Design a protein around this ligand. Structure first.
Ligand SMILES: [Ca+2]
Ligand SMILES: [Ca+2]
Ligand SMILES: [Ca+2]
Ligand SMILES: [Ca+2]
Ligand SMILES: [Fe+3]
Ligand SMILES: [Zn+2]
Lengths: 143, 361, 20
């Protein structure tokens, strides 16, 4: 990316790295007050954590913000949104994870029975190959 | 922790994906298997398109041979609006009795508002095929193209089946009788009276196999309402413009009494209006000593907010027995059959954008 | 907006059998 942006993100990365460990933990993300009530913080952290150690190093931090660049088409915005639902990162949206991600966003606005029923309906109406899960292609045709 | 593939709320049964075939819906004699159909539709099951079309067309053929004004003898269980609340319809038959041994008369409005309208149509049509001379269906103002395209019935058909199934329903709705003469005593209609209808023969000479016109006696049968001050008659006009429906008229207490006396009728049974107790008894007729008008409403907890009771009217052994019942649970649909991706995606892109802005400052 | 929300002979006698 841009060199001026690279230097600015390094400064912000240091302020977030409270313990000076070279990697951002979930607790360090939660230190920001705006992220304490945002129900999608844990999902974005897991997406950036491409190696799975539970923390976000600077390499993951750069590549995570790189996807949010203005030079990304609508597909780049839909691929990131797809990974929000795909918790296990297998390339498909399954029933359990779709419920769990939706439950994080809706909280108490829907009872568990009601949410499970519309999750079931969406998977049935969107699965076009019969695998029982929602691929990114099937995800595009819906949204 | 919690599995990402297996269903979280396992207490909820996963709906069946199989579509029932003709051999599974009609028996060896060609009669519908209403037990199979009821169990499958309660699980949100669907039929093959050709099978759904066969139920609609076969039921329409039976309706097509019936008169405008049905002649129904007592005993009979009269029912008001259903409005797509299929799971309350299951409770209705429990309360009123099984159609295998109970005569029924429905006053219309089977579709719209509720999100199980096509299930209500398929099951009632199958019952009509199975019990052509003991179960009767009248037309309501919602059984038309004008309203089902404005509300959710057309969208419901396109999501669960196809527009062809919707189109078949519209042609079937055109065959629905307009009224019933019940036990030589009661005129049963959906809406009410008409300024262009003064005798029972005025109903008989009507041409009902069409979309309801914007005006005229057919429109009035389906759309008219009693005056808001029915009984407390200060408006001496028999028919005034219906400002609530946008068409047809309000009819007054003198208008109803004059019609009842001119036609030797005891009362008018109708629906078309939500009621807190599921029914309303209007001012007695001075000539008969009987309520001149009765409204029945069979959709409990209308639109899932009204918290109203529903009722049916069991007329048997010279007894007008009102039977109330409460609402029943039903599976959840998002408004307008919206899926969870289209529902949550604007919230997803919003919150991920807020996080990125606050992290980068 | 911290959570996703749902978008917007003699005369007949008349008798009553209340709900349930
Ligand atoms: Ca750290
Ligand atoms: Ca990492
Ligand atoms: Ca997955
Ligand atoms: Ca699939
Ligand atoms: Fe109506
Ligand atoms: Zn109605």
């Amino acid at each position: 990316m841009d060199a001026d942006e690279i230097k600015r993100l390094g400064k912000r990365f240091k302020k977030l790295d409270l313990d000076n460990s070279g990697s951002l933990s979930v607790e360090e993300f939660m230190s920001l007050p705006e992220l304490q009530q945002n129900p999608l913080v844990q999902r974005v952290i897991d997406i950036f954590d491409t190696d799975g150690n539970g923390e976000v190093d600077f390499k993951e931090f750069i590549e995570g913000v790189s996807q949010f660049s203005v030079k990304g088409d609508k597909e780049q915005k839909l691929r990131f949104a797809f990974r929000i639902y795909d918790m296990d990162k297998d390339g498909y949206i399954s029933n359990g994870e779709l419920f769990q991600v939706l439950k994080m966003m809706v909280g108490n606005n829907l009872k568990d029975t009601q949410l499970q029923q519309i999750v079931d309906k969406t998977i049935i109406n969107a699965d076009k190959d019969g695998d029982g899960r929602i691929s990114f292609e099937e995800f595009c045709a819906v949204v | 922790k919690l599995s990402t593939t297996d269903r979280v709320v396992k207490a909820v049964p996963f709906p069946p994906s199989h579509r029932l075939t003709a051999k599974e819906v009609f028996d060896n004699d060609g009669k519908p298997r209403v037990d199979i159909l009821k169990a499958h539709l309660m699980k949100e099951g669907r039929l093959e398109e050709s099978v759904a079309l066969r139920i609609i067309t076969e039921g329409a053929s039976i309706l097509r041979q019936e008169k405008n004004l049905l002649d129904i003898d007592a005993p009979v269980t009269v029912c008001g609006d259903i409005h797509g609340q299929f799971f309350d319809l299951m409770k209705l038959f429990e309360v009123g009795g099984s159609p295998a041994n109970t005569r029924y008369l429905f006053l219309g409005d089977y579709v719209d508002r509720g999100y199980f309208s096509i299930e209500c149509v398929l099951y009632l049509w199958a019952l009509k095929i199975l019990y052509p001379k003991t179960l009767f269906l009248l037309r309501g103002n919602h059984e038309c193209r004008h309203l089902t395209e404005y509300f959710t019935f057309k969208q419901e058909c396109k999501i669960k089946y196809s527009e062809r199934v919707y189109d078949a329903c519209m042609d079937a709705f055109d065959c629905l009788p307009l009224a019933a003469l019940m036990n030589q005593q009661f005129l049963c209609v959906h809406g009410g009276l008409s300024p262009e209808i003064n005798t029972l023969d005025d109903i008989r000479k009507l041409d009902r196999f069409k979309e309801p016109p914007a005006y005229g006696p057919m429109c009035d049968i389906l759309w008219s309402d009693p005056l808001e001050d029915f009984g407390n008659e200060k408006t001496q006009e028999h028919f005034t413009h219906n400002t609530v429906r946008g068409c047809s008229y309000f009819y007054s207490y003198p208008a109803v009494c004059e019609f009842l006396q001119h036609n030797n009728l005891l009362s008018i049974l109708r629906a078309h209006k939500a009621q807190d107790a599921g029914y309303r008894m209007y001012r007695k007729s001075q000539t008969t000593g009987f309520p001149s008008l009765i409204t029945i409403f069979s959709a409990p907890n209308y639109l899932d907010v009204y918290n109203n009771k529903a009722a049916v009217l069991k007329y048997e052994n010279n007894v007008m027995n009102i039977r109330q019942f409460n609402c029943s649970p039903h599976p959840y649909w998002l408004p307008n059959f919206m899926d969870v991706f289209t529902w949550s995606l604007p919230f997803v892109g919003e919150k991920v954008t807020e996080m990125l802005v606050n992290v980068l400052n | 907006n911290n959570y996703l929300t749902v978008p917007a002979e003699d005369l007949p006698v008349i008798t009553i059998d209340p709900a349930s």
